[PDB]
Write a structure and sequence with these properties.
Chain lengths: ~25, ~25, ~25, ~25, ~25, ~25, ~25, ~25, ~25, ~25, ~25, ~25, ~25, ~25, ~25, ~25, ~25, ~25
């Protein structure tokens, strides 16, 4: 359950990073 | 921006796939 | 409907990828 | 060029088919 | 009218596939 | 050649009938 | 032999579509 | 005029089908 | 109303033509 | 016997078309 | 083959009737 | 012009039909 | 109206021929 | 219900078209 | 043949989607 | 069971599409 | 070049997510 | 083991995204 929670947060970070990349790109 | 759009949509799909994975796990 | 939402997002991404293939190809 | 058009169209059909599957699901 | 959209798209894909066959055949 | 030509025409006829279905539906 | 199977199926699709047009019109 | 267009297409499919019958028969 | 009667008859003719092509083919 | 019923249908169709041309012309 | 010629001619006549209808319609 | 083509084609079909009758009779 | 007069009679004649071929064949 | 059996037939046709494109391609 | 591999997979995915629409609808 | 089969197939298709985009781009 | 290797990684991640959803679902 | 394979890939992707944001920013 804790490992899953981490995967979720990495997934949330990755998504936000990609959204920033398009705003800048 | 078309490549960046595809990156966003794959990011969204991965984000949602992990959320489901947690919900089932 | 979580699984169906994932299917939708993969469909959107698959569609954009093909559109990019047509443009580039 | 025509094979890629056919791919675009099948992609659009697939995308629409999933959206409908979600509306009924 | 979403089912009739799906049907238009499938008919367009079927017309393109046959058209491609005729070119290769 | 003529069989493929017939298939093209049948595909064109089907595609048009579906478009008209959409307009009436 | 596969071309004739395509032929029948296009015919069955076109028959179905015509019936619908008959009904709605 | 779209119904007439469909009629034309069915007409020319029927003509091509008959041409083929004559060739085979 | 008459256009739809014609439409039906073309379809019934085309069906029979196809049925013949299936047997002979 | 199959060729003869096709002959009948073609004539029923052609009769419909002639009738329509008569009214419109 | 003589009956098949008659079917060809009827098919051709029917095609020209529909062309005329489309033009007048 | 198109009406005259139709008449010619019906004239040809009539002529063919009479020849077939003469053989069968 | 004369050309259409002729068309009707031509069609009326062809129909009778077709009926005879039907009965004899 | 009738639109759904048309959808099926369109799919069965499109499948056979794709099959042919694989073999010939 | 790479584009034909993609075509085949799009077709397998569209098949499954349709098949689900048939069952649910 | 079928939704997961569809999920698998969309992924298999996206993979092939991404592959070609990497090479082409 | 960098965006395309990001595309690859998102694909490889999404693949594994789906693969887990397969086994678990 | 499978969830750790996913964890590694999410990190590899997020690294690539961060390095892009680094270069562009």
């Amino acid at each position: 359950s804790k490992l899953l929670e981490l995967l979720r947060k990495l997934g949330e970070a990755l998504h936000k990073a990609i959204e920033l990349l398009e705003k800048w790109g």
